[PDB]
Design a protein around this ligand. Sequence first.
Ligand SMILES: Nc1ncnc2c1ncn2[C@@H]1O[C@H](COP(=O)(O)OP(=O)(O)NP(=O)(O)O)[C@@H](O)[C@H]1O
Ligand SMILES: [Mg+2]
Lengths: 49, 138, 50, 33, 49, 352
Amino acid sequence: RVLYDRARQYESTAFRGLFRFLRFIERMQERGDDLGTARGLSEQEDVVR
Amino acid sequence: VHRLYEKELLTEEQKDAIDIEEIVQFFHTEIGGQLIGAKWKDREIPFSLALPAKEIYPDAHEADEPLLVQGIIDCLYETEDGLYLLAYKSDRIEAAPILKKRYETQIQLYTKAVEQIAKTKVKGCALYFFDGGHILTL
Amino acid sequence: VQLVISYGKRFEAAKQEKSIIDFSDLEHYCLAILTAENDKGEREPSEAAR
Amino acid sequence: SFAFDEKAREQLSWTYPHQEVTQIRTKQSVSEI
Amino acid sequence: LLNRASISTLHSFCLQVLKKYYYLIDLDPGFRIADQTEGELIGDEVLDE
Amino acid sequence: GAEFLVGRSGSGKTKLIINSIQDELRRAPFGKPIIFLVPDQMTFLMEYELAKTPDMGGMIRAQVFSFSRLAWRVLQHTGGMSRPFLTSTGVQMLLRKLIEEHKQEFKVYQKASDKSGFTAQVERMLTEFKRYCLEPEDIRRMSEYRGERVLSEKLHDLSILYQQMEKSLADQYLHSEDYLTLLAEHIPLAEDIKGAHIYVDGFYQFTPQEFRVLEQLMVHAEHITFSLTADKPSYEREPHELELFRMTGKTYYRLHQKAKELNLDITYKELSGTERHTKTPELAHLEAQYEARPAIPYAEKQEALTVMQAANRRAELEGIAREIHALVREKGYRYKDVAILARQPEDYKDMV
Ligand SMILES: Nc1ncnc2c1ncn2[C@@H]1O[C@H](COP(=O)(O)OP(=O)(O)NP(=O)(O)O)[C@@H](O)[C@H]1O
Ligand SMILES: [Mg+2]
């Protein structure tokens, strides 16, 4: 799901289109940058934080 | 034409692209004469007509909304005989059965529009072509 | 020192081209806007600051 | 046997009564017809 | 008015200042805040250059 | 003459207007022109609705117009439509060109003149000026105020760009926001207007540029009806800041005072009872008790009003999708009966 949404945000910014997007992701990982795993329960919900 | 050029209803290049002879010839025609001599006249008539979808498309439904067909009628005039419709075409000619079918459905749309909305009958339709001053009736 | 200073200048230029800014550029450009005259720490408020 | 068998079956077999006209453009031109 | 209130991070305020007074510095009014990776990628490019 | 048709939302103003135009179409199929003036987003809607008579199934005497369409028609008969048209992008291009040769004359925007976003900002501003009838002279013309110095610097630079633009466009081109002004000064000379009946509805407010056109129609048209969504508005004074019908109220006040300024015969029609929420108690309660402080609680049952909480926009849209399915599968509605509105459509468009 967040793969979709992150595609949405990056398209809108400087990496529109498959080739540019993938290149961004690849260069991101290649210099040790990462992204967080998605979340299921929101912060508001009844959860141990 | 010149007045239309000074009202900016017609650009200079538009003004110079006029065959005055071709348009004057129309008023020497029978339909043209009947136009000049009419009870009531009107030009550039806008219209919207509501045709039930089944007529244009198989499988539509009586509940299903009508489609809206829209156009502009060039001229309409009324004599003691009835109401007549007039349209102008710059079609290349210099051919009659071909032009007849080329604009047939359009004329039928116009007639049906007048008949349905104005609740009046339409006797005779006319199409004037600038090339050679031809006039065909439908 | 001169290497780092060049990088910064070139870096700012690159971002200006693509019309983007750091988180850092937020504070520093804001500070730039808010100052009119800057004499070694003594900062005089510009019109925006006022 | 399950309490929602008939309703599940009926809903998965359902089609919109006016499906055919959902893509039909309302406005039409004399040229278009 | 609580919507338009200046209650935030200092960085958010900074963003407001830039948005209003872009013309006082060398900044495009339609500027955007880069995200960490795209900024740092641009940094990598200029550093290589 | 003028007729002020006023009511709250659900009163029946629009339907009333439609019925009037339809009756008038039955009585005289080839009568004097009927002009239905609505916002652009409303034009096709009204065309459809007017075309839905078992009686006639279409129109001829009556036409639906936006300000833009109306301008295009009247100018296509009276003139001024011949000169070339400029897009917003074209104007931006011109503005950039002017910047490059007048940037050294600026007082404040000299540094900003470099950026492409600045030309867009200036375009937006100048467009607003033209919409509020402010020629470059009035900009030049422009209670002690702290920001007066900078403001006058800005307005100075803007006036340079504005005057230069008007100079470059003069005798050659037509700005996008000039149609309405050109329309205002050709309406007196237009024959079709002279006997016409005019209905204006859907608008919450008008730009001064649109007001010019409206009062010209007040003068040279036979009758004109102004349909406003408000509750018993005052001609005596503008509405309070916190008032619900602030916008449409102010529109009423200004329109009425200009009708009075021109000695027109005015007619007042106030729609009281609801017609939309006649069968739905909850929605009538919501419509009536919206502004009320303190609000009286609804004491009956819940059926037609639902507040929904979604885990996210994805959940929100899917939930709504399910509900819509329910409505067209059990409750007997059709898809056309449903509307989905967002304050910020960009948050949902793709996902929708
Ligand atoms: N005479 C009527 N009897 C019953 N229902 C009606 C009548 N006229 C209109 N309606 C219904 O009322 C609803 C809206 O009426 P409408 O004419 O739009 O009022 P309105 O004043 O324009 N509301 P608004 O545009 O929000 O200020 C529609 O769903 C119509 O079906
Ligand atoms: Mg309405």
